[PDB]
């Protein structure tokens, strides 16, 4: 049938409506089947079950500015919360494009996991992906390149080997053992479980946690 095991694909999180880089692990039946996929860089989530609807062949082809026509549904990067920043990958129908001397302006209606979002100013016009349509093209069986996702930091430049205090631990600057990296519900700064002067031994089951700076 359609998608095979080991095949690299994109899994759409029905909640936020975004597409994530994943890989098929198993395929069961209830084209009405269940896809058990694992996310490349989300091991803490393990295997996840997906409807055939929320699974497509891994994106690979980039549509450059010149070939972007209005009314063309594609997959681009957008950050609904911080539009001026890099976000995640959603489906969108390009509404209009406007090129001047200072910038190529791309506008599209970003589709989310509940309802559309009309007339969004797409920042990354060079990173537009063509949606692989079921059947057309070959299956992705070889480990492909990585799309850049998640907001970037202008203090360490997202360089893994660099210690930061804005995107990493507000205290030391490390970036390891991230599931123990408490995040204050006030200044959004990260604090390791084992860094602040009474080192906590576990995760505060309490919904909120306000760091020392914020009491």
């Amino acid at each position: 049938f359609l998608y095979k095991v080991n095949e690299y694909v994109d899994a759409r999180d029905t909640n936020m409506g975004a597409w994530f880089e994943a890989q098929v692990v198993r395929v069961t039946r209830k084209e009405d089947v269940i896809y058990h996929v694992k996310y490349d860089d989300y091991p803490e989530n393990g295997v996840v079950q997906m409807n055939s609807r929320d699974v497509r062949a891994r994106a690979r082809t980039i549509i450059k500015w010149q070939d972007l026509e209005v009314g063309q549904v594609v997959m681009l990067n957008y950050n609904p919360d911080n539009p001026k920043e890099r976000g995640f990958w959603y489906d969108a129908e390009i509404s209009r494009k406007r090129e001047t001397r200072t910038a190529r302006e791309l506008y599209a209606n970003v589709v989310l996991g509940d309802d559309s979002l009309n007339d969004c100013r797409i920042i990354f016009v060079d990173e537009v992906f063509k949606i692989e349509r079921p059947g057309e093209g070959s299956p992705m069986v070889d480990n492909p390149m990585r799309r850049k996702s998640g907001p970037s930091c202008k203090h360490c430049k997202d360089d893994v080997n660099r210690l930061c205090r804005v995107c990493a631990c507000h205290l030391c600057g490390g970036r390891q053992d991230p599931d123990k990296q408490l995040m204050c519900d006030e200044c959004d700064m990260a604090f390791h479980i084992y860094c602040l002067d009474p080192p906590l031994s576990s995760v505060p089951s309490e919904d909120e946690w306000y760091c020392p700076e914020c009491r």
Binding site: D13, M16, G150, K180
Partner: peptide
């Protein structure tokens, strides 16, 4: 409680 691993998917 929000850990950096949890708040990833905004």
């Amino acid at each position: 409680a929000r850990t950096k691993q949890t708040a990833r998917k905004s």
